[PDB]
Amino acid sequence: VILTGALLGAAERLLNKGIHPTIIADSFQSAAKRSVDILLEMCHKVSLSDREQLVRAASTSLSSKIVSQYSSFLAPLAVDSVLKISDENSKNVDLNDIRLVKKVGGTIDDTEMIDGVVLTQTAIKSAGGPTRKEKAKIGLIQFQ
Amino acid sequence: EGVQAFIWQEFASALEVIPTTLAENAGLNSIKVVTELRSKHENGELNDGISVRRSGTTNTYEEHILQPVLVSTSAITLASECVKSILRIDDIAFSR
Amino acid sequence: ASALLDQALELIQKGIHPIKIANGFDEAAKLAISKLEETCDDISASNDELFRDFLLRAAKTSL
Amino acid sequence: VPSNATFKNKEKPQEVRKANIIAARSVADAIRTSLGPKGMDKMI
Amino acid sequence: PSNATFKNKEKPQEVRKANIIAARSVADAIRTSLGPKGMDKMI
Amino acid sequence: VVYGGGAAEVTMSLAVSEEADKQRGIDQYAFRGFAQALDTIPMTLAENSGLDPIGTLSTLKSKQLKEKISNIGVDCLGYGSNDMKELFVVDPFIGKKQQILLATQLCRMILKIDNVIISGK
Amino acid sequence: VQIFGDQVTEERAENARLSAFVGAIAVGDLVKSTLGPKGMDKLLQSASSNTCMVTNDGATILKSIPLDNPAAKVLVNISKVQDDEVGDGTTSVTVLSAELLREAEKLIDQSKIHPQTIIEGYRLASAAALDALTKAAVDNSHDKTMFREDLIHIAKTTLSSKILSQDKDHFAELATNAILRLKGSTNLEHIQIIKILGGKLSDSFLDEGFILAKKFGNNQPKRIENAKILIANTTLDTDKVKIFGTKFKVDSTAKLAQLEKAEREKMKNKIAKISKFGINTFINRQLIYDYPEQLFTDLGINSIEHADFEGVERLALVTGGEVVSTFDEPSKCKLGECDVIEEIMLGEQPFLKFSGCKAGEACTIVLRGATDQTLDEAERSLHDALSVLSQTTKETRTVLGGGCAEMVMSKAVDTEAQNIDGKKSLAVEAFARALRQLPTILADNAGFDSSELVSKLRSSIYNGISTSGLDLNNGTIADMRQLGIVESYKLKRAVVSSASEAAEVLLRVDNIIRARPR
Amino acid sequence: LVNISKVQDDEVGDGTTSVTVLSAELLREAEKLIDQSKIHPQTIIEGYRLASAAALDALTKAAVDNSHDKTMFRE
Numbered sequence A: 001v002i003l004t005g006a007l008l009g010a011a012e013r014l015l016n017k018g019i020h021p022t023i024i025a026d027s028f029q030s031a032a033k034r035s036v037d038i039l040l041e042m043c044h045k046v047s048l049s050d051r052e053q054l055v056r057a058a059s060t061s062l063s064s065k066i067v068s069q070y071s072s073f074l075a076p077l078a079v080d081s082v083l084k085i086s087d088e089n090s091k092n093v094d095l096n097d098i099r100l101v102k103k104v105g106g107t108i109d110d111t112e113m114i115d116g117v118v119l120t121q122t123a124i125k126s127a128g129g130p131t132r133k134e135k136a137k138i139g140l141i142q143f144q
Numbered sequence B: 001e002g003v004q005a006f007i008w009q010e011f012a013s014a015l016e017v018i019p020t021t022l023a024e025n026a027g028l029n030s031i032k033v034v035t036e037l038r039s040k041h042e043n044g045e046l047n048d049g050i051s052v053r054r055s056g057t058t059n060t061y062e063e064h065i066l067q068p069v070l071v072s073t074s075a076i077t078l079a080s081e082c083v084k085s086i087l088r089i090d091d092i093a094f095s096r
Numbered sequence C: 001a002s003a004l005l006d007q008a009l010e011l012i013q014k015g016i017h018p019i020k021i022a023n024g025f026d027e028a029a030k031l032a033i034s035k036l037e038e039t040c041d042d043i044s045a046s047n048d049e050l051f052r053d054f055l056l057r058a059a060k061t062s063l
Numbered sequence D: 001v002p003s004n005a006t007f008k009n010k011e012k013p014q015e016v017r018k019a020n021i022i023a024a025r026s027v028a029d030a031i032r033t034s035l036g037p038k039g040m041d042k043m044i
Numbered sequence E: 001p002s003n004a005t006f007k008n009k010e011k012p013q014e015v016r017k018a019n020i021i022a023a024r025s026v027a028d029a030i031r032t033s034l035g036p037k038g039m040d041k042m043i
Numbered sequence F: 001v002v003y004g005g006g007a008a009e010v011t012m013s014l015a016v017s018e019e020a021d022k023q024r025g026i027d028q029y030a031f032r033g034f035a036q037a038l039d040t041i042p043m044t045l046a047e048n049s050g051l052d053p054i055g056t057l058s059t060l061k062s063k064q065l066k067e068k069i070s071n072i073g074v075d076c077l078g079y080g081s082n083d084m085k086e087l088f089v090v091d092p093f094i095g096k097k098q099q100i101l102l103a104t105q106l107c108r109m110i111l112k113i114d115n116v117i118i119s120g121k
Numbered sequence G: 001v002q003i004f005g006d007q008v009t010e011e012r013a014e015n016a017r018l019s020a021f022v023g024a025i026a027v028g029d030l031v032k033s034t035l036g037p038k039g040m041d042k043l044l045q046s047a048s049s050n051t052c053m054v055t056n057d058g059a060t061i062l063k064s065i066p067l068d069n070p071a072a073k074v075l076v077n078i079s080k081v082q083d084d085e086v087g088d089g090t091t092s093v094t095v096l097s098a099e100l101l102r103e104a105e106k107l108i109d110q111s112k113i114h115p116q117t118i119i120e121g122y123r124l125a126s127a128a129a130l131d132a133l134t135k136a137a138v139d140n141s142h143d144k145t146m147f148r149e150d151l152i153h154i155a156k157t158t159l160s161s162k163i164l165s166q167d168k169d170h171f172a173e174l175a176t177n178a179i180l181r182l183k184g185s186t187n188l189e190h191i192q193i194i195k196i197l198g199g200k201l202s203d204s205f206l207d208e209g210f211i212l213a214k215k216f217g218n219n220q221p222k223r224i225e226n227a228k229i230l231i232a233n234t235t236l237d238t239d240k241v242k243i244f245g246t247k248f249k250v251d252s253t254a255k256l257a258q259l260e261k262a263e264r265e266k267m268k269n270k271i272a273k274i275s276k277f278g279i280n281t282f283i284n285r286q287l288i289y290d291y292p293e294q295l296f297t298d299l300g301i302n303s304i305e306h307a308d309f310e311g312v313e314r315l316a317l318v319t320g321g322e323v324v325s326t327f328d329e330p331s332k333c334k335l336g337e338c339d340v341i342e343e344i345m346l347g348e349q350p351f352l353k354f355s356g357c358k359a360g361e362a363c364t365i366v367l368r369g370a371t372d373q374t375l376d377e378a379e380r381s382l383h384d385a386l387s388v389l390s391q392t393t394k395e396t397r398t399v400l401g402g403g404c405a406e407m408v409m410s411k412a413v414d415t416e417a418q419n420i421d422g423k424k425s426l427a428v429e430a431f432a433r434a435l436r437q438l439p440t441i442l443a444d445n446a447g448f449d450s451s452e453l454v455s456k457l458r459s460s461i462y463n464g465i466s467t468s469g470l471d472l473n474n475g476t477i478a479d480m481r482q483l484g485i486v487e488s489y490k491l492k493r494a495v496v497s498s499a500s501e502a503a504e505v506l507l508r509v510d511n512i513i514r515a516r517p518r
Numbered sequence H: 001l002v003n004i005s006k007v008q009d010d011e012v013g014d015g016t017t018s019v020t021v022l023s024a025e026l027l028r029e030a031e032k033l034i035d036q037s038k039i040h041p042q043t044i045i046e047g048y049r050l051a052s053a054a055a056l057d058a059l060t061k062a063a064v065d066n067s068h069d070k071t072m073f074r075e
């Protein structure tokens, strides 16, 4: 949203200089197309998994939020979340497998990756028989 | 040597707003900082930029400030497409 | 005056203080006046017959 | 040289394009402050 | 025929009709005040 | 069928005019008013077609009084001949009759109104 | 007197006329900038819900803008039906209809000619124009290579004015390849427009097979090789039995538990009827409940639910099979086959991509862009291109574009202007100047001199040659056959016929009666 | 158009409607040059300067002086 306004500021003075808008428009498309080729020469390839690059990249890319100073433990959390889904074809990894559950309470420092599937809803407690389960078999009922 | 080249000069001048905005947010003088961007880049072909912690110019690869190429690619690409659509507008007519 | 103001808009975006902007035009204005005072020629050496023509040069310019 | 081959009528597109550019840049000035590590947050 | 002059104007004849009816309206107001069998008008 | 376009109107106008001076009475002015009322239709066609109503009305009255052939009317498209045998124009008798019947029967009702009360909405 | 009542505007013969002509001037000046390749797009701001619309089509501009003028409503309706018939050329109708009335305004005022006499000149002038347009056409479709090339030129000529003018070299292949895949079937419902945010305008790629925005079930696998496709307009939902009016009388709940057992056994036997064919996927029109969904797991059958009515025919024609609901006789209803049933992701929404089908009678145009206003322009642009190219399959004759069709039609009109006696010959020449005003406007939008190119084009075609045209890139006369600019014969025939009827309706007016609004 | 007619009424006392209809027709004829042909406004007035100069020169030769005879001036 800032580079767009900057190029419009460039086109502002160019409209007074007797140049057509279509010539100004095609110049940016040709200039932008050349800009892609310059960065393709500059960018460096990386391995499938590299904690030195991915963790530092994730921490220095947030850079503006409240959890940027908490990124000492959340940047590995983001890298470890995506590395579980791996493919050689460079697929578009879907973020539906990475669910972000919002619970009001506590602090951000208590945030940590749960090993299993965390459920948002609470128990019914109409009868309240069991308290804590161990070695339980989970089933998904769809009927009533 | 064409009128298309004169537009590309303004394209290069307007693209320098990103380090200028970083200088104003950090409080540093933009011309003094941007003058160092010009002084170090003719020899340094890449990884030369601004670091906010030290408030100066240094090698960004040593300080670990990296980003994907697709982010900057989509920014330059989508920005040119938006200006292409805005400049083709001529009239603002009220409708239902 | 609008041309100085329009070009000053781009320099305010860069973060230059307005007094340094104003002092720059003051030094540039006197420098331009000092140069233009040297390059222009005098017409008092000519006689009255040619001095009338110089008024006709400016009279047609103003009308 | 002059008075030939054209005359630019309907300069309102030029006025409309200027109004759209300054309108887009004025919105960009509010978003410009949030750039970089030294940017700020916005409450809406 | 097709080569006849249309004259482009029907507003003049309409205005003349509006004036004739307006002139005949007041002329017919004082029609019954003529002759020995006329009637007086108190205004 | 009949042949309209000003031919039936001028034919029916002079028929009542020739009988007006035979049956003077007091209703002769009503026969003349009915005659001149029928003449407004071909004069309207002459007005819309741009032709002169003086030459058009005078020609139809003078010609139709001389010759008995009653299929000559106002040529609006600007042809050189006014005889409608060649121009391919035909109208029904029931259609041209109802113009006179519904008109003369309405105007009796229009003339018989004296008191006119209009309740404002 | 006042018969019409209070708040009723009436006009008579000098306010009635010159209110429609200034309305024809008002509606024509808006769409003047949109005509041609260098035309500027108009932005429409709605009065409610802050809804904006970027659009170049003259019909869509007149759809949204309110116009209380009755004469402008005629131009609103003729652009609507022109968009319904051909889809392209609505702006040329509004411009040519307005300029015909602009010329006729001068013939009524300056020359003092009756309106009916002007129409009689336009009838003979329009007949001479269509006869020249018929003789100027050229046959096609005898060679498939030439028919392939002419559709590419028609797609380039159509998309030259839209937002795809820069990338028309790539979109011409995408536009013409989809039409040849229809196998003669003229219908636009078999082409889908999937909206995807991101990328650039030239990222639109041609899809092999058929792609749509649906999803598998909860337990279904990702990939199945050589999957048999079936389409059910069935109710795999709670079927009920259709003799509405069935209720269940229950004396004891012992048989009611066995009654519910029969309901589950009823639908089990229905899904068992599906497995007799041995299909690999199952496509249903409406929502599938969970109990049918669990039964497709062990049988190795994929599931797709909530398919649109258009999507049934769009997927069935690519599959080649027919929609089956009874599932009784496995002999008839031979199904198709698809190689790759693997889905892909373009943006944040997964789409089911198919490839390697029997037939491709239905297609799908994948688009990429920045703003939805550009995608809406991309939809309307290719909809006009695909509509023109689809009707070019049934109507084979075409005509050269680039403004040469307007001047070559006016040549026969000017030739037939001399031998017509009377005052209507000036109206015959007024029709010629109306055809000349279209290429006059093409030079104005491009920013070049209009009087020189129109004078050079007009003097060039009367010499004997009839292949010259306007080249707005260089700003001079050039050969249209070299550049490859050609348009359909029914398009320009509809434009001249619609514009002739447009001037005829508004020229036969003498009074305006505007009743009170509700 | 009101002021040019007032000056003509005070100056000569005749020809006011001719100035009003001719000055409006010059702007009417100049309208299509601006719209259709796209002529500069400075070019339209520049032609009217040379056209008006030749116009008054036509009246210089087209006039006739009847001062030599009072009977012809009376006529």
Ligand SMILES: Nc1ncnc2c1ncn2[C@@H]1O[C@H](COP(=O)(O)OP(=O)(O)O)[C@@H](O)[C@H]1O
Binding pocket: F004, F005, F006, F074, F075, F076, F077, F087, F089, F091
């Ligand atoms: N081509 C023609 N030549 C001569 N007379 C005509 C021609 N066309 C129409 N008319 C006459 O003009 C009349 C017009 O009637 P018309 O306007 O069609 O019916 P209405 O008045 O109910 O609309 C007809 O009665 C006919 O006699």
Ligand SMILES: Nc1ncnc2c1ncn2[C@@H]1O[C@H](COP(=O)(O)OP(=O)(O)O)[C@@H](O)[C@H]1O
Binding pocket: G034, G035, G036, G037, G056, G057, G058, G088, G089, G090, G091, G092, G156, G157, G158, G160, G161, G401, G402, G403, G404, G442, G470, G471, G472, G485
């Ligand atoms: N590439 C081109 N070169 C020259 N003229 C063109 C070109 N493309 C289109 N035209 C002209 O533009 C005119 C109108 O184009 P059209 O596609 O109908 O625009 P719209 O859909 O806005 O009416 C046509 O008569 C044609 O001659």
Ligand SMILES: Nc1ncnc2c1ncn2[C@@H]1O[C@H](COP(=O)(O)OP(=O)(O)O)[C@@H](O)[C@H]1O
Binding pocket: H014, H015, H016, H017, H018, H019
């Ligand atoms: N009987 C006539 N024959 C020919 N021309 C006439 C006759 N009467 C008037 N004219 C012309 O009509 C014009 C009338 O102009 P006028 O109405 O006096 O202008 P204004 O009212 O503006 O002074 C004159 O120029 C004259 O040439």
Ligand SMILES: [Mg+2]
Binding pocket: A061, A062, A063
């Ligand atoms: Mg970031």
Ligand SMILES: [Mg+2]
Binding pocket: G088, G089, G157, G158, G159, G161, G384
């Ligand atoms: Mg088009």
Ligand SMILES: [Mg+2]
Binding pocket: H014, H015
């Ligand atoms: Mg006078």
